[PDB]
Amino acid sequence: QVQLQQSGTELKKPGASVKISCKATGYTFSSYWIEWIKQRPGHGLEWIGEILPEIGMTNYNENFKGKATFTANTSSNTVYMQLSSLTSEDSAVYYCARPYDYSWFAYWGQGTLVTVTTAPSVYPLAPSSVTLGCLVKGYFPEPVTLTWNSGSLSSGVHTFPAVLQYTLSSSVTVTSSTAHPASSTK
């Protein structure tokens, strides 16, 4: 079955560069374009460009010229995209996709997240029912895994997505009666 396997998540300092890979399996590698699409959380979907692997012909969206470079390894059946001079603007999820034959998109990759190490400060927030909280402040990079009584409390909990300035908080509501692996902290 046709599969496009992209590379792991990436974290990069501003001004550096990154190479994302797309590994094609389950079809003749040379018979199809490979497409690259960018998704940022509020710009929707932008088309970066395409590359036709055999002859290494690259076709870019005018807006990405100089930002993005496609290459192809025909022996490893792999297409690489390289992003250079990274800014925060280039933080997004990058997809690679294969056309049904020459135009519209049929098969997509699982996506590669690109973001452009400090420990969290975790604080308790005390106030028919009642609402309590926890504040995780100043943690870099993502992600962070925050549970209440080690998972016991499930319904009533709202854990809010981080806001980069990364600061997330969580509220856990109960009745009146009743870990950041990047920094090695818990």
């Binding site: 929707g44 979907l45 088309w47 076709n59």
Partner: peptide, 16 residues
């Protein structure tokens, strides 16, 4: 839900 015109380059998408 996204729509895409694949008619001509560059390929463009809808806002979603």
């Amino acid at each position: 839900y996204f729509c895409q015109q694949y008619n001509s380059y560059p390929y463009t998408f809808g806002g979603g």
